[PDB]
Write a protein that binds this ligand. Structure first.
Ligand code: HEC
Ligand code: HEC
Ligand SMILES: [Zn+2]
Ligand SMILES: [Zn+2]
Lengths: 136, 137
């Protein structure tokens, strides 16, 4: 029922990054520089294959500072986590959703079984609820 | 001088950090855009406080970006910059060989001066083995 903290995620495949700045509709709460990481099982799904149970995607979100026309990574605000289990997480479409405040394992953020998170990712039904595309 | 090898499979490597450089920054030409730093296993050793062993490779992956309603989105790859550790072969440039690959393509070598220009700026970081990037969590 609970999503595992994705230990060692920092050494996974870096899928992409995006910057969300003040004025963007998702500034709350996704404002900052974010990086998406995928484990080996997730990569198979991302490649065009299907997602094996045990596939994990991580949204790693940082605050940034402006420094003379550079945006520089500040403090980690949170990690978001999607964990593939077709049977266990079938209520939110095969992915378990969890947020860890400041990336800390103890600071689980999701209180509704991940309904809130799913509600937005459900628009991406046709690509198994993942927004991120693999690039070169 | 001998040539820096193209770092095949660098995209699978450990993502050290990212930074955005916008118009007006000192490094706009030629480093403007979103860049990500990648390190092979041997480079991680040096980053974590060991010596950099020969074979250590750092990559600067530079993308253009588009600004679209207060989001910055990665566009096309502009270039990669490469540092390859070999204390013998790259002695003239402090043990690192420096190269640029236009659009990240192996044929599109950008360095014409044996990496002297790259080295000149990297030299300020003598104390940390000529590397700027620091490992973060
Ligand atoms: C819209 C209002 C969203 C809500 C609420 C949540 N997420 Fe989401 N997520 C959203 C977008 C537009 C993207 C892509 C960002 C990009 O850089 O392209 C994401 C991405 C993720 C990822 C990375 C994998 C992917 O699908 O691309 C993860 C791990 C993720 N999201 C998890 C997550 C969790 C745990 C949420 C509730 C706490 C959550 N998301 C809500 C849009 C929205
Ligand atoms: C002056 C400023 C320069 C010049 C002329 C070059 N580089 Fe280097 N470089 C510079 C900075 C301030 C940084 C850090 C970016 C960050 O903190 O995110 C870098 C980084 C690199 C990297 C990543 C490794 C590292 O942090 O040291 C590589 C692989 C790299 N630079 C290579 C490189 C090459 C091949 C150059 C000449 C074509 C070159 N640089 C020039 C600062 C400067
Ligand atoms: Zn200015
Ligand atoms: Zn703007």
């Amino acid at each position: 029922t609970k999503v595992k903290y994705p230990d060692g995620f920092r050494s996974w495949y870096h899928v992409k990054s995006m910057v969300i700045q003040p004025g963007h509709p998702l500034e709350n709460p996704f404002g900052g520089i974010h990086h998406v990481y995928a484990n080996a099982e997730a990569i198979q799904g991302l490649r065009g294959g299907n997602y094996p149970d045990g596939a994990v995607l991580v949204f790693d979100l940082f605050d940034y500072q402006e420094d003379n026309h550079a945006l520089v990574e500040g403090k980690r605000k949170l990690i978001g986590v999607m964990e593939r289990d077709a049977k266990r997480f079938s209520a939110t479409g095969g992915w378990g959703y969890e947020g860890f405040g400041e990336g800390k394992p103890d600071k689980r953020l999701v209180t509704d079984g991940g309904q809130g998170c799913f509600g937005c990712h459900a628009a991406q039904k046709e690509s198994q609820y993942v927004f991120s595309r693999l690039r070169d």
